[PDB]
Amino acid sequence: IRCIGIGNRDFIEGMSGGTWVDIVLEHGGCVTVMSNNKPTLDFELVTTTASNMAEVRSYCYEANISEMASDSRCPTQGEAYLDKMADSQFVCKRGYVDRGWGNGCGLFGKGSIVTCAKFTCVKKLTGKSIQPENLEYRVLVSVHASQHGGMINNDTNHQHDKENRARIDITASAPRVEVELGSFGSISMECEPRSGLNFGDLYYLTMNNKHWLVNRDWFHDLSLPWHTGATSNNHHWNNKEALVEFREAHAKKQTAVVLGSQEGAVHAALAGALEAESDGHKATIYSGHLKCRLKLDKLRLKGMSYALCTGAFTFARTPSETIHGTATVELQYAGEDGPCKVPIVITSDTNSMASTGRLITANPVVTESGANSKMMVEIDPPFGDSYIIVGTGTTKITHHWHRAGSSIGRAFEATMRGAKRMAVLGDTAWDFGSVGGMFNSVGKFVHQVFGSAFKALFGGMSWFTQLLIGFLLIWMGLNARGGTVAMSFMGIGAMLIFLATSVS
Amino acid sequence: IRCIGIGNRDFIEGMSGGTWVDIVLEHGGCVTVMSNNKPTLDFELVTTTASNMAEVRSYCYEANISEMASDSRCPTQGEAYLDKMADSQFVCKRGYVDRGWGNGCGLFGKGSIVTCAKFTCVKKLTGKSIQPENLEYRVLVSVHASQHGGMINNDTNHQHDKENRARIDITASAPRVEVELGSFGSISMECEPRSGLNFGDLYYLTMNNKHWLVNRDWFHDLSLPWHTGATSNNHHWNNKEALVEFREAHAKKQTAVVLGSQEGAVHAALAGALEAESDGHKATIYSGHLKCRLKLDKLRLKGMSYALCTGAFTFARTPSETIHGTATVELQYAGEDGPCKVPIVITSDTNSMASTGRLITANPVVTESGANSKMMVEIDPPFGDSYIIVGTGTTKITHHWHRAGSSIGRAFEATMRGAKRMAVLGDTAWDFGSVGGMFNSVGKFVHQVFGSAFKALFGGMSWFTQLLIGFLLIWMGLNARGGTVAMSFMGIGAMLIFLATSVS
Amino acid sequence: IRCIGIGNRDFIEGMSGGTWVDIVLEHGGCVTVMSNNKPTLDFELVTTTASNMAEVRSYCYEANISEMASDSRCPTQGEAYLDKMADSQFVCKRGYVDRGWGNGCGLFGKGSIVTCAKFTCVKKLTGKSIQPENLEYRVLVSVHASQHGGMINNDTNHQHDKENRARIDITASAPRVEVELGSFGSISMECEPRSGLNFGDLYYLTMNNKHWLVNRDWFHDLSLPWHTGATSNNHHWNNKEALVEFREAHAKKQTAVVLGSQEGAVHAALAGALEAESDGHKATIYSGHLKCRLKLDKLRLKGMSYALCTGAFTFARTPSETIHGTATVELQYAGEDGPCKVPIVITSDTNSMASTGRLITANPVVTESGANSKMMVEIDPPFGDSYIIVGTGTTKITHHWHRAGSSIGRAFEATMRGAKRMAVLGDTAWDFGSVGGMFNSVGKFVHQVFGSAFKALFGGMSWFTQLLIGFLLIWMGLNARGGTVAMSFMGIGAMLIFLATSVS
Amino acid sequence: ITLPSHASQKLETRSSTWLESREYSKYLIKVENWILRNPGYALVAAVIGWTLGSSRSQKIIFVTLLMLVAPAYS
Amino acid sequence: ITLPSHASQKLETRSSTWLESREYSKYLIKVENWILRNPGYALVAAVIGWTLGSSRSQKIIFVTLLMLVAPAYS
Amino acid sequence: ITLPSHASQKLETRSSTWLESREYSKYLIKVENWILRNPGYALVAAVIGWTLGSSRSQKIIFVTLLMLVAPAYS
Ligand SMILES: *[C@@H]1O[C@H](CO[C@@H]2O[C@@H](C)[C@@H](O)[C@@H](O)[C@@H]2O)[C@@H](O[C@@H]2O[C@H](CO)[C@@H](O)[C@H](O)[C@H]2NC(C)=O)[C@H](O)[C@H]1NC(C)=O
Ligand SMILES: *[C@@H]1O[C@H](CO[C@@H]2O[C@@H](C)[C@@H](O)[C@@H](O)[C@@H]2O)[C@@H](O[C@@H]2O[C@H](CO)[C@@H](O)[C@H](O)[C@H]2NC(C)=O)[C@H](O)[C@H]1NC(C)=O
Ligand SMILES: *[C@@H]1O[C@H](CO[C@@H]2O[C@@H](C)[C@@H](O)[C@@H](O)[C@@H]2O)[C@@H](O[C@@H]2O[C@H](CO)[C@@H](O)[C@H](O)[C@H]2NC(C)=O)[C@H](O)[C@H]1NC(C)=O
């Protein structure tokens, strides 16, 4: 039931013949899996956690200077020198000043001058490495077990609800799990925790209690003073000259000034990176995906041998419509004939009692043996007018329902959802809701080839360059002499423009 | 004599017929003026000062946020609203979250949310305006009065040397001064303190006790929170959204976070600006020029009616050469025939004993009546070998002198220096060492119009764009149809390239 | 008389009417000046000395290393680090080794390793600068005053012979000297001690008590460890990696080794430099020239009023011929005639007794008034056979002289000597034995222009490249008979070849 | 200094990037402010592009490329 | 944020500007880094430049302008 | 280390330079040793020279220049 209020929600109608299905969990999503004579299940990937991270390099972004000193030499007498040039904590520079009889020199001309200042870092950021064998994914499973509506985002005493909820920890040395769901049997998950988000070309950057996932190339192109991630008491700062500027004032003196704190400049440089969080010494990540294979052969309906309920039902609240077109119905049941089966039909006309819409919650039941107990069902009504009829006999309650839209619009939104999933996941999108098949394999192969070529050519472009190159390619295609290069140019251009103007 | 050990030094061989000459003092340079029967003078513009500057605009570069509050609405219930959205000390933003039975809402869909936080500036930078009536230039004048070598950059008891040294303050309320020089008479300066450096399109920027002179349209395009006018506690700020970012994480909540200190980012944005200093509340500037007209009628040689000396001269130092080709000779003199005229010849042929060079210190004399007193002459010796002979009779002393180079190299160096002064000063360069004439007038007028057009077309261009546009123009000229356009393109391109490679 | 045994000797046959002449003293030379009614003089530049030299830079040519250490890092963990990398006296380097489970690492791949070693200089060489105003030339002057042959290279009690010998020190602050020569009057020398040898392009190099004069470009391109001449107690050695090599042995270990003493390699690099000597803290130099002007108006013959000798003359030694064709005759006189005039004729035919060759020793006299006294004459006998007849009356002695050669061969030898002098001195050669003139000045100017162009084009070429380029130029001048270009090519080629095959 | 600009992680996950709300304003505001501060360069670029290109499309493309190169000096 | 870049005050006075020692490093370093990190863009830029220009000079200028626009996204 | 070679101060003064006795030995010995220990390069250079030169003089000059370039690798 944990999938009901979510706006990014997928529905998998598992194949009847087989008992396994391929799913891809994402962090801003949730998957509902329904199979023929088994309970409906909700899957959500909630947390990625990286541990045992190694520090690579520290960068200074705020520094001070002190103990400035200078020294000068007469012309044609070699370069100037200070003992502070033999100290590694000082940054020094050499230039030329004017010398003559007025300055105390015997000659006239450019003499050598040296300026030294003691460097000190006050604020630094770090970068760490993440090995895919140290990740740990957390997945939550919920059963559509006719819990009432006040349990959707309810975590009170969730460690006791061992039958409706399950929490799974997927690591690389434990990628296959048997999840026990009480009287519903079990499911088996076989996941691939090593090939999700590509943490191989990402560093975990920490700056002032904020955390990002950044590119490694970008992290090595930083232009700040740095030292190694190795442990040491006194670190030697490399490239101190990145934060200290030396200047000669009209060839009479030389002076050193430190630049300001770079926190805001780095914030501006991280504009497109991914944000992350911390948990002690562990990185907590809320982006990326996880591919799994579900086997439901040991999953069984609890209460498929229940008796029908004999008492009367009331609507405990108004049935609401979720943004995907399904509808939630909370019922209250009077009379105590124990756990029983809830009779509910969705029909186009009350005369014929012909079912026309299906259920999402498979096998809705009353779960308690008390007097006035609540339960919730999720249904998938047909387009147009319908009736939700609950109960049997002379106490049947009815609710009129209207579902706007059409089936053509539903197919169109499904197509756009699939296209967005392709754009986000690449060729992995072909493994979503897949049960094998030659068509899926050929599609995944062609997508792999074309995606590799497309990333090789147009990999390092921004929305601006994407737009420019796309318009140029569309123009070049509109003027191509023969075919097969006109359509190719225009297709690549349209793809680039679609990528540039995308969202999320 | 204050102009001797200076690398950027000019020599104005004054007019013979006239009595006034136009000079242009610059902060990095120094000018030596010599006329026929008058002493040689050294002029140096040493300080520009601006007082009572007008506050224009303050920008915040480091801020805090606090007192975060939020308000949410269920779907189809309008926008969320907080009372702090009416307070101007708060920054607020609206977004959408997912709402349903799990959150506490009766419907499913995008509910409106609003977040507000109290903005507080921690550190700000200020911009001020400088008016031409606020400026006060300081010029120093020294006389070549046979002071010894230990007086070149000597400021001990400078308030007692009323004959050889002079200090001049030029303002817009007093652009004309007359300077008395003891027995040398007096000079008169008529300067233009309202046309030196274009402070009309520059602001005086202050940030954390460092000061710049910056463009105005750059200061108006800063993207930080700002206000206008004076600054006092708990102020009001515009565009606070430049330092605060709001985010909805997976459509589940909304958070506000403040960006980091922008000190270093501003430092990096100030790359090509000019630096400055402070004197309490006064801007102290060491850049720019000042054009003056010099009148030397009441300037007279002192001691031109002395008797020649009769004692024995010695060399007190070794005659050294300044980088422009002159030589400074410090002489010690025994004998007490009082203030006497020093006999000194510079000859390249001891058979004829004819003079070959020319002095810079006009009328060198012994300035004291004691036993052994020192003086210093400055000479412009001829190219090749020569002798500097001091004294008369048998106690003469000689010094051999060799001056490398030729007059063609001298002329080429003079042409290069003139081209550099043109590039730096625009049409004002025609007023340097000018004594009138219609040729100077027409040249200055043509330079004025061409410089106006050139600044309109290629005003703000880095060396990169200068180089690129110059090469493109050179190509366009090389492939033009004929003349009258081609050479114009080539000249503009060559000028752009000559600017892109220049230094200082 | 000091120029008699020298093999590189020049003769200035003084102008008859004139009283001054220009000479160029060279270190491996000797000049004999003779004027009509004046004694003959010998000039020799013996020593050049430079004092007050400033140390510019010290280079290490023999060093040690000690206290080597290494550190390693596992892959994907950044660079390795030792605390010695924070010590300036240590030279360090980083590389990659193989890491795996065998090396104690958790991953497999390229790990980072760092090696550090303590550098220590054992033997260093020094470079110093020479100021042309610190040079001091020493010139020795001798008179052909009929001293006997046992005085040519005799310096016993030379401080008492204040009449026949003179020592002259020439500096820049005393370039003109009046040399008194007892009864012979006095000469005046006007030298140019600032333009002899271009010491402004040379450093004084000292290595293990041996000294050279070297170019400055060559000295600044040395690739050894170096520190500044501005000496401190503990110097920081720059470029320590020039004497230390790091090597990784099969990607398992890094090691450091120091190169050997570079003394012999420096000796080999100094192949074409100049040698020099030391005198305490001063450089003693025995190469280069000194242009000077001689004024002889106060020089008079001593003993032109003596009476002829009356006693008996004997040949005290066999008249010997010098390398240039002159003859030295040592006579012994028996007779107490006091200081008397020696009667001597040099005749081809004894019938007319007409003199045919001139004397070098003007006015040969018997100096001492004693019994058996010795004296020496030097004569320039004619070509062929002649008689040297000495004495009066019937007791006069004769010596037969044969001088081989002709005046044509003499002129050819003089042309070769002049061409060698030109090749060594450039345009300064036109000032040798010169009294002025328009032809002299025009030739010197043309020589200056052509020598400047030639030094610009073919300046720094060895004999090998000189030969190759000269042959190529001769070839292309042969197969190209354009206007005035063939002879130019072949003339430059012949010049290059003549320079290549020349000897010191 | 001049820190490097991170590439956009848009369309890699479902999350929003660090400062995604300003991803479009960044280049647009810069280019527009530069073009307003330097109006004569527009004439320079028009002349150069009209002289270099032969067909009208080539001229337009040259002018656009120059006007885009100038504000971000590249 | 996007702070504007100050125009160079070189050749306005005799003094050196604020960070004059780094006035060449920024553009060169940025452009060369981006260029040697993205070789496929060179290919596509060359294709577009050769397809758009008519003469050799036009194609060369097209390719140069594209290779300058891409690194500094403008 | 490759220390630089000092230019010859011959014909600068009347003195002899530091190691003037070996001024001709240092090049001839090396060149001839290399040419004798590498006979096949002679044929290589001959082939190249005869392939690039048109007239006989150009061929001889090319062969000579290659034979000189090889021993002192420059
Ligand atoms: C949120 O859940 C709590 C806990 O519910 C209990 O534990 C669950 C795991 C599941 O087993 C439920 O069926 C359990 O009732 C709810 O608090 C309970 O409410 C019931 C109803 O009155 C009461 O009998 C229990 O004593 C309560 N338990 C506790 C620990 O207080 C709570 O009502 C739920 N919130 C909403 C809005 O429905
Ligand atoms: C720097 O100047 C001081 C002061 O010079 C005096 O005041 C000047 C304005 C000018 O009028 C000078 O002629 C004056 O002498 C020098 O100090 C004096 O030095 C002289 C020796 O030259 C000595 O006789 C005086 O007693 C000194 N008086 C004082 C007050 O110091 C000083 O020597 C100068 N520095 C150098 C390096 O020469
Ligand atoms: C080398 O010279 C010495 C010294 O000569 C004396 O001093 C000279 C400056 C000059 O004035 C000479 O005329 C002087 O005689 C010679 O020694 C002298 O020899 C003479 C004669 O043999 C003798 O009468 C003196 O007493 C000697 N005096 C001294 C101080 O020795 C010496 O003979 C010369 N050598 C040769 C080979 O001739």
Burial of residue B305 (number of CB atoms within 10 Å: 0-12, 13-18, 19+)? exposed
Distance to chain E for A299, nearest Cα, Å = 51
Pocket lining for ligand 3, CB < 6 angstroms: C 150, 154, 156-158, 160-161
Distance to chain A for B17, nearest Cα, Å = 35
Q: What is the enclosing helix (H) or strand (E) of A10?
A: strand A9-13
Q: How many CB atoms lie within 10 A of CB C261?
A: 13
CA of A375, nearest ligand number: 1
Long-range (24+ apart) CB contacts under 8 A made by B169-176 are B169/B136, B169/B137, B169/B138, B169/B139, B170/B136, B170/B137, B170/B138, B170/B139, B170/B290, B170/B292, B171/B133, B171/B135, B171/B136, B171/B137, B172/B132, B172/B133, B172/B135, B173/B133
Atom of ligand 2 nearest to the CA of B160: 9
3-state secondary structure of A14: coil
Q: Tell me the chain C residues in contact with residue B397 when contact means C-beta distances shorter than 8 Å.
A: 173-174
Length of chain A (residues)? 504
The DSSP 8-state label assigned to residue B131 in this structure reads -
Q: How many CB pairs under 8 A join D and E?
A: 62
In a 13 Å sphere around the CA of D25, the CA atoms on its Cβ side amount to 10
Supply B502's token pair: 């220049």
Q: Which residues pair with B121 in a beta bridge?
A: B63
User: By C-alpha distance, which of D31, D64, D28 is closest to D46?
Assistant: D64
Pair C353, C135: CB distance under 8 Å = no
Pair C108, C49: CB distance under 8 Å = no
* Residue B1 CA, ligand 2 centroid: distance in Å: 15
Asked whether the beta carbons of residue E40 and residue A476 sit closer than 8 angstroms, the reply is no
Q: Distance (Å, rounded) from C-alpha C341 to C-alpha C353? A: 19
Q: Distance (Å, rounded) from C-alpha B90 to C-alpha B120? A: 9
In a 13 Å sphere around the CA of B83, the CA atoms on its Cβ side amount to 1
**End-to-end alpha carbon distance in chain B:** 25
CA of C149, nearest ligand number: 3
Query: Going by beta carbons, is chain B in contact with chain F, meaning 3 or more pairs sit under 8 Å apart?
Result: no
* Residue B163 CA, ligand 2 centroid: distance in Å: 15
Supply C476's token pair: 């292309």
- Interface partners of chain E (CB pairs < 8 Å, 3 or more) are A, B, D
Burial of residue B282 (number of CB atoms within 10 Å: 0-12, 13-18, 19+)? middle
Asked whether the beta carbons of residue A261 and residue B259 sit closer than 8 angstroms, the reply is no
Q: What chain F residue is nearest to C422 in terms of C-alpha separation?
A: F11
Q: What are phi and psi of B468, to 5 degrees?
A: -65, -50
Mutate to test the pocket of ligand 3, among C153, C157, C160, C373 (most ligand atoms within 8 A of CB): C157
Pair C489, C470: CB distance under 8 Å = no
Which residues have C-beta within 8 Å of that of residue C473, sequence separation ≥ 6? C489, C490, C492, C493, C496
**Which of A78, A230, A233 lies nearest to residue C80, judging by beta carbons?**
A230
Q: How many CB atoms lie within 10 A of CB A278?
A: 13
Crossing angle between the packed helical segments F25-36 and F39-52, to the nearest 10 degrees = 90
Q: Tell me the chain A residues in contact with residue D59 when contact means C-beta distances shorter than 8 Å.
A: none
Q: Tell me the chain D residues in contact with residue B264 when contact means C-beta distances shorter than 8 Å.
A: 1
- Cβ of A394 closer than 6 Å to ligand 1, yes or no, is no
Angle at C295 between CA C292 and CA C296, to 5 degrees: 135
CA of A370, nearest ligand number: 1
Q: Distance (Å, rounded) from C-alpha E70 to C-alpha E8? A: 24
Burial of residue B324 (number of CB atoms within 10 Å: 0-12, 13-18, 19+)? middle
* Residue C4 CA, ligand 3 centroid: distance in Å: 19
- Interface partners of chain D (CB pairs < 8 Å, 3 or more) are A, B, E
Pair C176, C187: CB distance under 8 Å = no
Which residues have C-beta within 8 Å of that of residue B145, sequence separation ≥ 6? B1, B39, B163, B164, B184, B302, B367
Pair A245, A254: CB distance under 8 Å = no
Q: What is the widest separation between alpha-carbon atoms in chain A?
A: 121
Interchain CB contact of C172 with B (< 8 Å): yes
Query: Going by beta carbons, is chain E in contact with chain D, meaning 3 or more pairs sit under 8 Å apart?
Result: yes
Pair A348, A326: CB distance under 8 Å = no
Pair A124, A58: CB distance under 8 Å = yes
In a 13 Å sphere around the CA of C375, the CA atoms on its Cβ side amount to 26
Dihedral (C-alpha) B410, B414, B420, B422: value to the nearest 10 degrees?
Answer: -170
The DSSP 8-state label assigned to residue A34 in this structure reads E
Atom of ligand 3 nearest to the CA of C148: 38
Burial of residue B387 (number of CB atoms within 10 Å: 0-12, 13-18, 19+)? buried
Asked whether the beta carbons of residue C194 and residue B402 sit closer than 8 angstroms, the reply is yes
Distance to chain A for B443, nearest Cα, Å = 31
Pair C281, C170: CB distance under 8 Å = no
Asked whether the beta carbons of residue C175 and residue B315 sit closer than 8 angstroms, the reply is no
Q: Distance (Å, rounded) from C-alpha B369 to C-alpha A154? A: 108
Distance to chain E for B347, nearest Cα, Å = 38
Dihedral (C-alpha) B29, B30, B35, B40: value to the nearest 10 degrees?
Answer: -160
Helix and strand counts by DSSP (H, E) for chain C? 6, 29
Q: Distance (Å, rounded) from C-alpha A499 to C-alpha A501? A: 6
Q: Tell me the chain B residues in contact with residue E22 when contact means C-beta distances shorter than 8 Å.
A: 271
Asked whether the beta carbons of residue D6 and residue A273 sit closer than 8 angstroms, the reply is yes
Q: What chain D residue is nearest to E66 in terms of C-alpha separation?
A: D65
- Cβ of A156 closer than 6 Å to ligand 1, yes or no, is yes
Q: What are phi and psi of B441, to 5 degrees?
A: -65, -50
Range of the domain at E51: 1-74
Pair A214, A270: CB distance under 8 Å = yes
Token pair 């045994």: residue: C5
User: By C-alpha distance, which of E6, A272, B221, B267 is closest to D32?
Assistant: B221
For chain A, the C-alpha Rg in angstroms (whole number) is 33
Which residues have C-beta within 8 Å of that of residue A140, sequence separation ≥ 6? A2, A43, A44, A46, A165, A166, A167, A168
Interface test with D, best of E6, E63, E74 (most D CBs within 10 A): E74
Q: What chain D residue is nearest to E23 in terms of C-alpha separation?
A: D1
CA of A160, nearest ligand number: 1
Nearest residue (by CA) to ligand 3, atom 16, is C156
Distance to chain D for B190, nearest Cα, Å = 37
Burial of residue D64 (number of CB atoms within 10 Å: 0-12, 13-18, 19+)? middle
3-state secondary structure of B154: coil
3-state secondary structure of B459: coil
β-pairing verdict for B210-215 and B41-50: unpaired
Q: What chain E residue is nearest to B419 in terms of C-alpha separation?
A: E11
Asked whether the beta carbons of residue A468 and residue E69 sit closer than 8 angstroms, the reply is yes
Our measurement of the distance from residue A340's CA atom to the centroid of its chain's CA atoms, rounded to an integer in Å, reads 41
Question: How many independent structural domains does chain E possess?
Answer: 1
Q: What is the widest separation between alpha-carbon atoms in chain D?
A: 48
Q: What are phi and psi of B258, to 5 degrees?
A: -100, 140
Distance to chain C for B149, nearest Cα, Å = 18
3-state secondary structure of B33: strand
β-pairing verdict for A373-380 and B41-50: unpaired
DSSP states of B299-331: B--SSTTPPBP-S-EEESS--EE-TTS-EEEEE
- Cβ of A479 closer than 6 Å to ligand 1, yes or no, is no
Pair B40, B92: CB distance under 8 Å = no
Nearest residue (by CA) to ligand 2, atom 5, is B156
Token pair 């030029």: residue: B170
Ramachandran area for residue A384 (φ above 0: left; ψ -120 to 50: alpha; else beta): left
* Residue E27 CA, ligand 2 centroid: distance in Å: 54
CA of C330, nearest ligand number: 3
* Residue B142 CA, ligand 2 centroid: distance in Å: 16
Our measurement of the distance from residue C352's CA atom to the centroid of its chain's CA atoms, rounded to an integer in Å, reads 49
Q: Distance (Å, rounded) from C-alpha A486 to C-alpha A479? A: 7
Q: What is the resolution of this structure in A?
A: 2.6
Q: Distance (Å, rounded) from C-alpha B277 to C-alpha B288? A: 14
Q: What chain C residue is nearest to A133 in terms of C-alpha separation?
A: C107
Supply B290's token pair: 């000042």
3-state secondary structure of C472: helix
Query: Going by beta carbons, is chain D in contact with chain F, meaning 3 or more pairs sit under 8 Å apart?
Result: no
Burial of residue C354 (number of CB atoms within 10 Å: 0-12, 13-18, 19+)? exposed
Pair C243, C225: CB distance under 8 Å = yes
Distance to chain B for D6, nearest Cα, Å = 16
* Residue B367 CA, ligand 2 centroid: distance in Å: 14
Q: What is the enclosing helix (H) or strand (E) of B408?
A: helix B407-425
**Which of B315, B350, B402 lies nearest to residue C190, judging by beta carbons?**
B350
Q: What chain D residue is nearest to A424 in terms of C-alpha separation?
A: D11
Supply D73's token pair: 């000096």
Q: Tell me the chain B residues in contact with residue E14 when contact means C-beta distances shorter than 8 Å.
A: 8, 26-29, 287, 424, 504
